[PDB]
Ligand binder design. Structure first.
Ligand SMILES: [Zn+2]
Ligand SMILES: [Zn+2]
Lengths: 84, 258, 523
């Protein structure tokens, strides 16, 4: 291989990330409507809801449900999932 | 202006410092801009004579013009130390895993206090990836909530060559490295192909090729072509020259652009 | 002995028409201050002490200053002081007093300023003629005074507050002078110039970092007051930009002298004038200064009705630069409250702008902010607009698409970093999720049906590609990190930092896998 990298001296700048209160799975403000339900004609199910698991990070029940039909776990950290 | 430059040209004892500090009293802000830049360069490039002396200069300015005048200064310094300890920790954290085949360092800077800006479009070379992948995920462990912005155009490295009659150490820009590395695939590349690959804005890429071409390593289809003149084009062909020779084994190809 | 020398130098120089200073220092230092006064009194000889004795001021003024005071010692010093201020030729005197410029620093500045302010008057009036003098004394005074830090809710150790009230007392007589004059004579002119010069100084340094309930209200009031007292009242009002932004804040936020200004009261009219000042506040790094800027923006913005703010207002610079300046502080500033606040102010701003104004500001912040988070925020907002933007536009047709090319554009798209690109991609993916759900193909008020194929090519697939490449790299780096670890015979926790990344991928995929499930299902 004609070119081999011996050293690399790199510069990087850091800034702060911005923080907002969001369903991480879909992204919509917690306290606000889950997105699929924002795109919905007003429905029975249209009254998704705040769910918390033991891990303490929180989701729209709507979103975390379809997350839990697939894996058994929590998406953010990784833990098998029980409510609170 | 030069009232500033003089200090960095001298600093590139504390007596000869104070001997400026008198002339300091004499529009100190536009001065502090320039002096900042001076310091910044003296920092990222390492060097800068005696560090304790730089600190004594700072703290000398501290009481003089008060807190906010200095503070960005102080932030650059402690940013440097912070980077030293960062690198230490990283070398220790990798110590249980497969090592990096290259020799890695990074200075991380507070985006706020440093003049440096805007990064550039760039495509990180695969050979450069794992280092990056590893350190990114490391910083995220030491600080959540932070974002890292890599400034390649200030990033330098060392290539080692296997295809020459002789083995060279090339001290190069990261744009240089990214270009050259492209030659482990093919022996000739059109400039277009090189922007579609290293993702380097053509405006920049041109000057960079011009440097490499000036360097022995790459060559045009036209041998009679003056590289200090001829204007490179999308379909222009850049060839690797295996005829390369140097009376130096470790050679630095990374040079002020003109 | 030094006394004898002093007398020898007197009788030597008392015929005619530097060491002299030295014998003064000595005589004053531990020993007799008595015979010094015994020399000056009897008022012989006036000519030297007139042309010379000002030299003795410094050692005296240190023997006042450096001395702890609280003494019946000092009054004998004060005597010879006053006697000096009385008998000395004025031109060379204040200069000595202006030695204060250098002489102290930090906490012990005030006591110098407080001590010599009166003599500075008595001298300056002695020469009626010069404004240039006052210019000098005010300049130097403000120089020294600018150095001391500005307190909040604090008794003050540095003496800044009493020094500002004291300055006001000093300055009044000079501004009460010009208020009444027959003549236009140039001395009056240059006196006005120097005066208001000092007013822009004080407007600038002390008041710009100052916080309010209030000695800084008294100071502001009294200075801007001086601005009315001379010509060019504040209402009419480079490098003065700091002074002017301080003034703007002082008037509009603190309501100081707000009465003189015309009623206005259309929040628009004030806004467009004030925006510039806000920008000048936000470019600053001080917490106090950033805070003030934010307050002025919020205040200006509170009054405006939602979606009033007209597109064409963005054709003023501050109107674009300021949201940017907000994005600056959100990301770059130490103080979290300020970051959270700045984010808020951004969202308020967006809210005020009319539809196309929003679209414009989005498009700008997308290609400007260069932060994947604030890009995700911008995406959110766009989704909100699209939603609202249908009942009976800018967020619907090819304009929307033009705006989509910007969000769904993949930088180095196949290989992008999805670790730090994770949030903007989550945003974009949810926005899609909405779009494919809301409108049918064959209804198609939105966007997409035309773009869908081109999207799945230029966004969706390469995102699959990227996810794959990524999970692969990360799994591998891990497994063989273990292989390395075991082959070497702290504890492997070091690896968890990687596991995190895997989650972030499996998150996205679950989202992506969902979108396509719809992309077919609703097709
Ligand atoms: Zn959700
Ligand atoms: Zn729902």
């Amino acid at each position: 291989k004609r070119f081999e990298v011996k050293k690399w001296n790199a510069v990087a700048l850091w800034a702060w990330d911005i923080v907002v209160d969001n369903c991480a799975i879909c992204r919509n403000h917690i306290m606000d409507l889950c997105i699929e339900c924002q795109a919905n004609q007003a429905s029975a199910t249209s009254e998704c809801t705040v769910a918390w698991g033991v891990c303490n990070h929180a989701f729209h029940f709507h979103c975390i449900s379809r997350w839990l039909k697939t894996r058994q776990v929590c998406p953010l950290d990784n833990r098998e999932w029980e409510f609170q | 202006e030069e009232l500033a430059r003089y200090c960095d040209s001298l600093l590139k004892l504390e007596d000869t410092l104070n001997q400026v500090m008198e002339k300091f009293k004499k529009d100190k802000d536009v001065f502090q801009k320039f002096y900042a830049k001076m310091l910044a360069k003296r920092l990222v490039h390492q060097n800068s004579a005696s560090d304790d002396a730089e600190a004594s200069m700072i703290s000398k300015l501290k009481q003089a013009c008060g807190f906010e005048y200095t503070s960005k200064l102080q932030r650059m310094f402690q940013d440097i130390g912070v980077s030293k300890d960062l690198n230490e920790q990283f070398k220790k954290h990798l110590t249980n895993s497969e090592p990096l085949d290259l020799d890695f360092s990074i200075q991380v800077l507070s985006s706020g206090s440093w003049p440096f800006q805007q990064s550039c479009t760039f495509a990180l070379p695969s050979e450069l990836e794992r280092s990056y992948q590893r350190f990114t995920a490391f910083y995220a462990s030491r600080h959540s909530g932070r974002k890292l912005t890599w400034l390649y155009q200030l990033s330098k490295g060392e290539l080692v060559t296997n295809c020459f009659k002789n083995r060279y150490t090339l001290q190069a820009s990261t744009f240089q490295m990214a270009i050259l590395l492209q030659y482990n695939t093919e022996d000739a590349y059109t400039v277009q192909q090189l922007t579609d690959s290293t993702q380097i804005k053509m405006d920049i890429l041109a000057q960079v090729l011009q440097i490499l071409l000036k360097s022995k390593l790459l060559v045009l289809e036209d041998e009679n072509a003056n590289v200090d003149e001829v204007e490179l084009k999308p379909d222009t062909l850049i060839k690797l020259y295996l005829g390369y020779k140097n009376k130096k084994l470790r050679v630095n190809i990374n040079v002020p652009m003109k | 002995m030094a006394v004898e020398e002093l007398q020898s130098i007197i009788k030597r120089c008392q015929i005619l028409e530097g060491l002299f200073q030295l014998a003064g220092q000595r005589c004053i230092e531990e020993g007799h201050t008595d015979q010094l006064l015994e020399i000056i009194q009897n008022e012989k000889n006036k000519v030297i002490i007139k042309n010379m004795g000002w030299n003795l001021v410094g050692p005296v003024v240190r023997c006042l200053l450096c001395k702890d005071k609280e003494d019946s010692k000092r009054k004998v010093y004060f005597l010879i002081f006053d006697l000096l201020v009385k008998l000395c030729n004025p031109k060379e005197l204040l200069l000595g007093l202006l030695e204060l410029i250098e002489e102290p620093s930090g906490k012990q500045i005030s006591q110098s300023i407080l001590l010599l302010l009166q003599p500075l008057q008595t001298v300056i009036q002695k020469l009626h003629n010069k404004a240039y003098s006052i210019g000098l004394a005010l300049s130097t005074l403000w120089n020294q005074l600018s150095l001391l830090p500005v307190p909040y809710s604090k008794m003050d150790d540095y003496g800044l507050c009493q020094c500002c009230k004291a300055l006001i007392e000093f300055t009044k007589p000079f501004v009460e002078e010009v208020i009444d004059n027959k003549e236009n004579s140039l001395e009056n002119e240059k006196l006005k110039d120097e005066l208001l010069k000092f007013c822009f100084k004080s407007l600038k340094c002390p008041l710009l970092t100052a916080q309010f309930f209030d000695p800084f209200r008294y100071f502001a009031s009294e200075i801007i007051g001086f601005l009315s007292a001379i010509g060019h009242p504040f209402p009419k009002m480079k490098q003065l930009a700091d002074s002017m932004a301080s003034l703007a804040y002082l008037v509009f936020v603190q309501g100081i002298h707000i009465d003189q200004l015309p009623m206005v009261l259309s929040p628009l009219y004030l806004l467009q004038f004030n925006m510039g000042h806000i920008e000048v506040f936000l470019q600053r790094t001080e917490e106090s200064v950033i805070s003030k800027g934010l307050e002025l923006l919020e205040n200006s913005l509170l009054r405006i009705e939602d979606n009033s703010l007209l597109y064409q207002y963005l054709e003023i610079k501050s109107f674009l630069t300021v949201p940017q300046g907000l994005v600056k502080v959100m990301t770059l500033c130490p103080i979290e409250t300020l970051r959270k606040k700045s984010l808020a102010m951004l969202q308020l701003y967006i809210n005020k702008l009319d539809s196309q104004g929003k679209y414009t500001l989005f498009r700008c912040l997308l290609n400007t902010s260069n932060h994947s988070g604030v890009e995700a925020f911008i995406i959110q907002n766009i989704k909100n607009q699209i939603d609202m933007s249908l009942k009976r536009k800018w967020f619907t047709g090819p304009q929307l698409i033009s705006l989509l090319d910007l969000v769904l554009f993949l930088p180095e798209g196949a290989e992008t970093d999805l670790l730090q690109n994770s949030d903007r991609i989550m945003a974009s993916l949810n926005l899609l999720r909405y779009l494919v759900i809301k409108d049918n193909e064959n209804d198609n008020q939105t966007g997409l049906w035309t773009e869908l194929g081109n999207i799945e090519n230029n966004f969706l697939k390469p995102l699959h590609i990227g996810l794959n490449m990524s999970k692969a790299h990360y799994e591998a780096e891990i497994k063989n990190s273990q292989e390395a670890q075991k082959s070497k015979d702290p504890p492997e926790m070091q690896l968890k930092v990687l596991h995190s990344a895997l989650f972030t991928f499996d998150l996205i995929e679950s989202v992506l896998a969902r979108v396509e499930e719809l992309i077919e299902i609703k097709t």
